[PDB]
Amino acid sequence: MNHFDTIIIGGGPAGMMATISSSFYGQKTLLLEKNKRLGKKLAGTGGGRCNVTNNGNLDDLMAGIPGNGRFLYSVFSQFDNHDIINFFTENGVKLKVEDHGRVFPVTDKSRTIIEALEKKIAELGGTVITNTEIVSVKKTDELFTVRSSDQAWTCQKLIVTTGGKSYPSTGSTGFGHDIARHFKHTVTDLEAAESPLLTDFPHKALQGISLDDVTLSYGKHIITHDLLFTHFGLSGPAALRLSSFVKGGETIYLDVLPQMSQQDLADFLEEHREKSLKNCLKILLPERIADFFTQPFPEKVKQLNLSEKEALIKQIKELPISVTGKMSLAKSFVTKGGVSLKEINPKTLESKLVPGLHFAGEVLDINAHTGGFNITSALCTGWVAGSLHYD
Numbered sequence: 001m002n003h004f005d006t007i008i009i010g011g012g013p014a015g016m017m018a019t020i021s022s023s024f025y026g027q028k029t030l031l032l033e034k035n036k037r038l039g040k041k042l043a044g045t046g047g048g049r050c051n052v053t054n055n056g057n058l059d060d061l062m063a064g065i066p067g068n069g070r071f072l073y074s075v076f077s078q079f080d081n082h083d084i085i086n087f088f089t090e091n092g093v094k095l096k097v098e099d100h101g102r103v104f105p106v107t108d109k110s111r112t113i114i115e116a117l118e119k120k121i122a123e124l125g126g127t128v129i130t131n132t133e134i135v136s137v138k139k140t141d142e143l144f145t146v147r148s149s150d151q152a153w154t155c156q157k158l159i160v161t162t163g164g165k166s167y168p169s170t171g172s173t174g175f176g177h178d179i180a181r182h183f184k185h186t187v188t189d190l191e192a193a194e195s196p197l198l199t200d201f202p203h204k205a206l207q208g209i210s211l212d213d214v215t216l217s218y219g220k221h222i223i224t225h226d227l228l229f230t231h232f233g234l235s236g237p238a239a240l241r242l243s244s245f246v247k248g249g250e251t252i253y254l255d256v257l258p259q260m261s262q263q264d265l266a267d268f269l270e271e272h273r274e275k276s277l278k279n280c281l282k283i284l285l286p287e288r289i290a291d292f293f294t295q296p297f298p299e300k301v302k303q304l305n306l307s308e309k310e311a312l313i314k315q316i317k318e319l320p321i322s323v324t325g326k327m328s329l330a331k332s333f334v335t336k337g338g339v340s341l342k343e344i345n346p347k348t349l350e351s352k353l354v355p356g357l358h359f360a361g362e363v364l365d366i367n368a369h370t371g372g373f374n375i376t377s378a379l380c381t382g383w384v385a386g387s388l389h390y391d
């Protein structure tokens with residue numbers, strides 16, 4: 001029997017969640033996935049630990065989804081980040097919160113998240129067929145026909161959850177945009193968002209250092225968040241966020257101690273005048289950062305003259321960094337752009353052009369910061385798309 005009430009294409013978080021709600025509402029539901037495994041992209045989020053959502057309040061959630069977050073009022077009125085947390089804990093998955101509201105499985109293993117979702121799908125009678133690339137979708141009368149190279153499936157309701165365009169090696173290569181265009185939907189310009197930065201800097205001096213809530217400035221863009229020094233440049237939220245405003249050739253500025261004024265730092269130094277400059281700074285900064293700034297100066301605080309102190313303080317508060325480029329769309333964490341939201345019903349995620357056609361997840365023209373916000377949108381829009389609505 002190749003006929004289902006609801007067919008979902010793409011088994012990332014949107015598709016898995018859509019399969020669960022579709023089954024929960026009593027639809028006979030089929031999830032088709034290109035890869036052998038579900039949630040291949042999802043599994044690599046949060047350094048492989050799976051940043052499944054964010055525990056913030058409404059203000060935090062909206063701030064975390066700056067690419068059309070407003071569209072989600074109705075979705076979030078039906079299923080939100082607290083429902084995601086509840087769902088996992090109610091199915092015996094223990095969750096924890098880390099910095100900036102980031103939620104993870106306590107196990108620190110993505111398979112904990114993915115297996116719980118599969119288990120729920122099975123328990124609700126959903127069917128999943130993996131290792132099956134869908135290559136065609138068409139609608140005739142009131143039936144969608146979904147085809148691989150090899151087989152055909154039909155349904156009354158189709159949900160497209162095939163992702164965006166970044167990290168195409170995980171399986172997100174744009175098929176959902178093709179389906180959209182086939183049904184005469186507008187797909188907006190697609191472009192990199194949340195892109196690690198390439199810099200011209202001595203990377204080995206600092207690589208692997210993470211800094212908490214430091215400030216990166218370029219023009220009027222001042223971003224305060226965590227920063228990661230990498231072998232090629234900068235990553236972590238502060239760099240990812242600023243990457244929306246730089247593309248190469250710019251000088252950006254780093255303030256490693258945003259909570260201390262230049263005067264506070266001058267007082268700190270005066271109160272530690274008998275000390276080694278590098279050692280006394282360890283209470284404020286990681287040792288490798290203290291090494292970087294203090295290397296060319298005299299060893300003890302009191303051995304610095306006034307010029308040296310002022311020079312050092314300005315370096316700590318305003319380090320110039322030369323940005324040479326940013327990762328391509330393929331090498332970025334999020335796709336900015338997707339199916340035009342004007343053509344989508346925000347309450348149901350149904351196409352305004354073709355009845356029974358739905359989109360959820362990053363295939364839509366919604367983009368968010370890393371830290372759980374894209375996964376939240378995908379899970380929540382998935383849930384809602386899979387739900388039935390009565391009136």
Ligand SMILES: Cc1cc2nc3c(=O)[nH]c(=O)nc-3n(C[C@H](O)[C@H](O)[C@H](O)COP(=O)(O)OP(=O)(O)OC[C@H]3O[C@@H](n4cnc5c(N)ncnc54)[C@H](O)[C@@H]3O)c2cc1C
Nearest residue numbers: 010012013014034134162163171361362371372373374375
């Ligand atoms: C390295 C990295 C780190 C990230 N970290 C974070 C983070 O910390 N917080 C956060 O919120 N977001 C993060 N993201 C983004 C987040 O992972 C995605 O936005 C989210 O997974 C989108 O979910 P989705 O279900 O819309 O699409 P995806 O998870 O991309 O799933 C789409 C699925 O559709 C399948 N598919 C595509 N075409 C076909 C076809 N023709 N037939 C069958 N199946 C198909 C694909 O194989 C894929 O499994 C990160 C992304 C990357 C790449």
